[PDB]
Design a protein around this ligand. Structure first.
Ligand SMILES: Nc1ncnc2c1ncn2[C@@H]1O[C@H](COP(=O)(O)OP(=O)(O)O)[C@@H](O)[C@H]1O
Ligand SMILES: [Ca+2]
Ligand SMILES: [Ca+2]
Length: 263
């Protein structure tokens, strides 16, 4: 309780999503620097995703972890909805990935650690993200990873997927096949990110949706020569077609290659 647009000086655009237009902003009274995610009611309603928005606010407002981005509150005004988010000053892992093409083992292991901790806290409440990918991974002032954008978040188990498009790149077989899914979806994503971080691209990238779908469902990926044995071991363990065969997060955090490299 209980903001209005008038409470904020709006700064520069921080990023655009499918629906979200995100701006740096400062709260006039306190001079608190933050981010406003702006959504258009028309676009949400017409058509599809008004329920995701409610899900995102409800779920994310209630989460408190250093590796999960804060949602502080919200408001609206007949044309738009405004989410008030914690501002992440070092940008997205996506842009960082663009900047240096690929990450070293130390950086990758640290990102995975920070990710595994946030996910393990999420999973502790049976909350599953389902949209873990570099666009949704922000960096705090200490360069620490922060999981963001809970539009796709839901409680486990779930069904449907609803319907998503954009890439399939980060989705496990049980999600691309419309099946019932677990917290295990987030473990598959973790494996996909781990490979993208070291290699510079996702294990199942292809030129078409139909081929990507096929590669994911058949789980066909290969490692460049430069990927080390301990990273190969971790990724092969996360990218298993059968969800239950996938590791618990504790197993990931205690993986030798993770413990060896993680700063
Ligand atoms: N709190 C934030 N701090 C800095 N940049 C952000 C923040 N939230 C989002 N962004 C940027 O805006 C983009 C879209 O935000 P997001 O909420 O993920 O979009 P959408 O919900 O529309 O998919 C992100 O990928 C990122 O580049
Ligand atoms: Ca997003
Ligand atoms: Ca979203």
């Amino acid at each position: 309780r209980q903001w209005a647009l008038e409470d904020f000086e709006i700064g520069r655009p921080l990023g655009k999503g499918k629906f979200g237009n995100v701006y740096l902003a400062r709260e006039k009274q306190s001079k608190f620097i933050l981010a406003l995610k702006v959504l258009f009611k028309a676009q949400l309603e017409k058509a599809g995703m008004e329920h995701q928005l409610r899900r995102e606010v409800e779920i994310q407002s209630h989460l408190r972890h250093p590796n999960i981005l804060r949602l502080y509150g919200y408001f609206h005004d007949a044309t738009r909805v405004y989410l008030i988010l914690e501002y992440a000053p070092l940008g997205t892992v996506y842009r960082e990935l663009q900047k240096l093409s690929k990450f070293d083992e130390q950086r990758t292991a640290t990102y995975i650690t920070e990710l595994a901790n946030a996910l393990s806290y999420c999973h502790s409440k049976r909350v599953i993200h389902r949209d873990i990918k570099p666009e949704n991974l922000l960096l705090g002032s200490a360069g620490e990873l922060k999981i963001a954008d809970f539009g796709w978040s839901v409680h486990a188990p779930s069904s449907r997927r609803t319907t998503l498009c954009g890439t399939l790149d980060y989705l496990p077989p049980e999600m691309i096949e419309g099946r019932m899914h677990d917290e295990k979806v987030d473990l598959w994503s973790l494996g996909v990110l781990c490979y993208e971080f070291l290699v510079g691209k996702p294990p199942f990238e292809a030129n078409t949706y139909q081929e990507t779908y096929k590669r994911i469902s058949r789980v066909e990926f290969t490692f460049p020569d430069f990927v080390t044995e301990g990273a190969r071991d971790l990724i092969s363990r996360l990218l298993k077609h059968n969800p239950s065969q996938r590791p618990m997060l504790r197993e990931v955090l205690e993986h030798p290659w993770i413990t060896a490299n993680s700063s």
